[PDB]
From a paper:
Following a strategy previously established for structural characterization of TLR4/MD-2 complexes, we co-expressed the [name] ectodomain and each minibinder in HEK293F cells and co-purified the complexes using affinity chromatography followed by SEC. This improved occupancy, and after optimizing grid preparation and data collection to overcome a clear preferred orientation, we determined cryo-EM structures of minibinders 7.7 and 8.6 in complex with [name], each at 2.9 Å resolution. Minibinders 7.7 and 8.6 interacted with the concave surface of [name] in slightly different manners, with α1 and α2 of [name] binding to LRR15-LRRCT and α2 and α3 of minibinder 8.6 binding to LRR13-LRRCT. Unlike minibinder 8.6, for which clear density was observed for all three α-helices, we could build only α1 and α2 of [name] into well-defined density. Interestingly, density corresponding to α3 of [name] could be observed extending from α2 at a low threshold (0.08σ). Given the proximity of the minibinder to the glycan at N413, we conclude that a steric clash between the glycan and [name] makes α3 protrude out from the complex. This conclusion is supported by our SSM data for minibinder 7—obtained in complex with [name]—which showed that mutations in the hydrophobic core were more tolerated than would be expected for a well-folded protein. For minibinder 8.6, the α2 and α3 helices were well-aligned (Cα RMSD: 1.6 Å), but α1 was slightly displaced from its predicted position (Cα RMSD: 2.7 Å). The altered conformation of [name] α3 described above may result in exposure of hydrophobic residues in the protein core to solvent (e.g., L11 and L30). The interactions between [name] and [name] were mainly mediated through electrostatic interactions. Residues E9, Y25, K28, and K32 of [name] were crucial for forming electrostatic interactions with [name]. Due to a nearby glycan, the third helix of [name] was disordered when bound to [name], a phenomenon that has not been documented before in designed minibinders to the best of our knowledge.
Residue numbers in the entry:
A (entry chain B): 1 to 40
B (entry chain A): 27 to 335, 343 to 696
Write the structure that this text describes.
Amino acid sequence: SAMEYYVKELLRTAEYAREAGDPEYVRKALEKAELVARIL
Amino acid sequence: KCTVSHEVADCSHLKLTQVPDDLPTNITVLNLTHNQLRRLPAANFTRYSQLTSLDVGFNTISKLEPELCQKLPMLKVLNLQHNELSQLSDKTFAFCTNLTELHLMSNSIQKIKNNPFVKQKNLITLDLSHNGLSSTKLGTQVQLENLQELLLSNNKIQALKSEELDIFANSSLKKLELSSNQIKEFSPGCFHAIGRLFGLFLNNVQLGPSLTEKLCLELANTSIRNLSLSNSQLSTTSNTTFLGLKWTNLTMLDLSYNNLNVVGNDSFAWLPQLEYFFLEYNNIQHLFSHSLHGLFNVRYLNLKRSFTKLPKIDDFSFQWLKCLEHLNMEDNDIPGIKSNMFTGLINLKYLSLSNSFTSLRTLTNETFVSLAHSPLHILNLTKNKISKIESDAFSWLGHLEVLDLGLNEIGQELTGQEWRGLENIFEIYLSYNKYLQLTRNSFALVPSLQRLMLRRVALKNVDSSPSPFQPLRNLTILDLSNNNIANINDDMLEGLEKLEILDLQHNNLARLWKHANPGGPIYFLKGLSHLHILNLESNGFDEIPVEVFKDLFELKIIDLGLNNLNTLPASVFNNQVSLKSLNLQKNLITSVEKKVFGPAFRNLTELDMRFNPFDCTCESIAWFVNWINETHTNIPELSSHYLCNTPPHYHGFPVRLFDTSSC
Ligand SMILES: *[C@@H]1O[C@H](CO)[C@@H](O[C@@H]2O[C@H](CO)[C@@H](O)[C@H](O)[C@H]2NC(C)=O)[C@H](O)[C@H]1NC(C)=O
Ligand SMILES: *[C@@H]1O[C@H](CO)[C@@H](O[C@@H]2O[C@H](CO)[C@@H](O)[C@H](O)[C@H]2NC(C)=O)[C@H](O)[C@H]1NC(C)=O
Ligand SMILES: *[C@@H]1O[C@H](CO)[C@@H](O[C@@H]2O[C@H](CO)[C@@H](O)[C@H](O)[C@H]2NC(C)=O)[C@H](O)[C@H]1NC(C)=O
Ligand SMILES: *[C@@H]1O[C@H](CO)[C@@H](O[C@@H]2O[C@H](CO)[C@@H](O)[C@H](O)[C@H]2NC(C)=O)[C@H](O)[C@H]1NC(C)=O
Ligand SMILES: *[C@@H]1O[C@H](CO)[C@@H](O)[C@H](O)[C@H]1NC(C)=O
Ligand SMILES: *[C@@H]1O[C@H](CO)[C@@H](O)[C@H](O)[C@H]1NC(C)=O
Ligand SMILES: *[C@@H]1O[C@H](CO)[C@@H](O)[C@H](O)[C@H]1NC(C)=O
Ligand SMILES: *[C@@H]1O[C@H](CO)[C@@H](O)[C@H](O)[C@H]1NC(C)=O
Ligand SMILES: *[C@@H]1O[C@H](CO)[C@@H](O)[C@H](O)[C@H]1NC(C)=O
Ligand SMILES: *[C@@H]1O[C@H](CO)[C@@H](O)[C@H](O)[C@H]1NC(C)=O
């Protein structure tokens, strides 16, 4: 499955956005990654 | 007093003068890591008959009587940190030989006296980090026969002598710290006296020329494997430096942050056994072909910021590194790729080009020819201000797995002539691009793709063509967000049955589910049987078709959030059974019904119906309160977020505080 690479993808996109300046999506991605980690 | 989990009395920060004297006698780790003690007598310690790991660091202790070791034969590790043991005695621990580790950091010892310890039958590790020692005369006779990891981390040492190490005649040293200590002399012969000196650390010490050559000659005929020369001022390299390191079987090196300005000529050819290589963070300005002679055993290379902001990497300066596997040419001002640049690196497996080029605005066909003979698995290529991709610039890459082309300025109109080849592609990172107009045949040459990332890419021509994603059949993640897409047909997902994640987040699809649209609402969520997460958020759907979610059976999270959506039709989640979550945050939902939201709340785990202004009446929220009475679903906080807003009769109340029996 791609769930593990999806929880990696959200983090990497979070650093990309943080370097680009999109804090709200950074927070949403962090919360979503934590929730998916719970559900996995 | 102190929290005890299983066998540790973690008294973390309890400023105290005496031992607790009330914990169970079978505790071992009396972790008093700051508790401001001043004496450790052999009377209160009697009860602690099973003490194993006494850690009293960051404390003020000035004396340790030998009686303390009378009652502690089971002690394994002691850690006296930041104490005041400047004065030491011969009998402070002489018979006390059962340790498995020892630490005396920052005890401010200026002298070793005569022989503070002479048996040391089981002392694996010994640390003297920030004391101020100016020698290594830890004894007078043969000792430390079982020591492995000695740490002279930061001292006032000045040189090294053969006589002072005679105590180490038969000691097997593994990793010897001599860092952060200005050494200005090396008397003839220091390390062949030591039986098994394996490692060596000389970081943050200014050696420079006229000292490095003498050191490498001094290391001759020794069994040293690792090495460390970080931050040592080394502006150049010549064939006379590291000359004495031809007889060493050295398997590691470290020459980073030392600002290697230039590389003269055949250097390092005296290191045929070097397996690792650290030259990151250098102020290098040139690279001759004969710069890297003889490094045919290096497996890792670290050149992240060696090439400084123009360098002229000469022709065939990489052909010698025949065994390189990891390349780290990340943050440099490399001016373009010459036709004879990366020739011969047939062992390469990781490229890491990102913020390296100031010339790669476009990618022509004759730009990646250098890597034709080199296998490649990861091609980073991020934010090198790429402007446009021309035809057949990736032909030479056949074993490639990741095309991580994000944070670029790729604005053009694709046709399919840029992925010529790439039959083994597993991932393309096309996010964060200016614009990308599509055709019906843009991705026909990549049927092996598994991860199509298309976020923050103004993606036009999505519906006019039959299906831009029709050729894609092995796609699992389809990230489509922040594109302002506002017109969709039954063409997104045709034959894409193994797609698992279908984010559509900042899209203008609100107008295409309405009931006034000719031909009925567009039912595009079709043909899906393996969709896990479907983020349909922040669009503006103030309507839901009754059968809009028919195909989704094994779906887990069906997030519809940040919309103006309300009045959920009945049986909207009738067929979804394995729906392990909902989310309808920031909507206009006011009334919950046992038919509208009953079958969906069966095997649930999370809810975020956060800020919707609930109508607060005995019929609007009754099943909801009777269901939140017993929460088998781990819902997030209910405090000051679920509020009664519509009816003034009972306005301003949390949901749980509703009276069920009244109605
Ligand atoms: C390390 O050991 C080698 C021998 O394995 C030493 O080489 C000898 O060098 C001396 C003069 O320097 C010659 O007279 C011998 O004939 C050499 N022996 C050989 C080549 O087998 C080398 O000098 C040693 N390194 C030192 C002492 O720094
Ligand atoms: C190290 O490099 C230097 C170059 O700086 C070499 O010195 C040259 O050696 C050749 C061959 O013996 C002779 O023409 C001169 O001694 C030098 N020529 C020039 C132009 O400098 C040196 O031989 C190399 N090897 C060692 C061990 O020093
Ligand atoms: C890379 O692309 C250039 C540009 O098309 C190619 O150069 C052409 O090559 C053909 C074949 O010999 C000539 O007939 C043309 O006159 C060349 N110029 C142009 C503008 O087309 C070049 O051959 C390509 N290289 C490879 C390896 O495919
Ligand atoms: C391509 O290189 C970039 C830049 O080094 C990588 O992005 C880094 O990813 C790691 C892993 O999460 C982060 O800790 C770094 O902060 C990221 N760098 C930056 C500048 O944000 C990226 O991961 C590489 N591509 C792949 C496929 O690994
Ligand atoms: C150690 O003492 C505590 C205190 O009662 C006890 O709960 C624990 O079982 C003891 N453990 C052992 C190994 O004796
Ligand atoms: C002892 O306490 C220190 C200070 O917090 C901590 O770093 C260390 O991990 C602890 N050791 C244990 C719990 O074994
Ligand atoms: C302590 O050291 C002595 C002397 O070497 C040895 O006989 C004894 O077994 C050791 N005990 C422990 C618990 O290490
Ligand atoms: C040399 O350093 C590497 C990397 O830290 C390590 O894996 C290796 O064990 C070290 N060599 C020795 C002899 O310990
Ligand atoms: C590496 O060279 C040194 C220098 O003579 C030698 O002592 C050592 O035995 C060599 N290593 C091996 C594995 O032979
Ligand atoms: C090193 O010296 C050789 C001598 O034959 C020469 O050909 C080569 O260009 C030199 N490399 C430099 C100066 O970088």
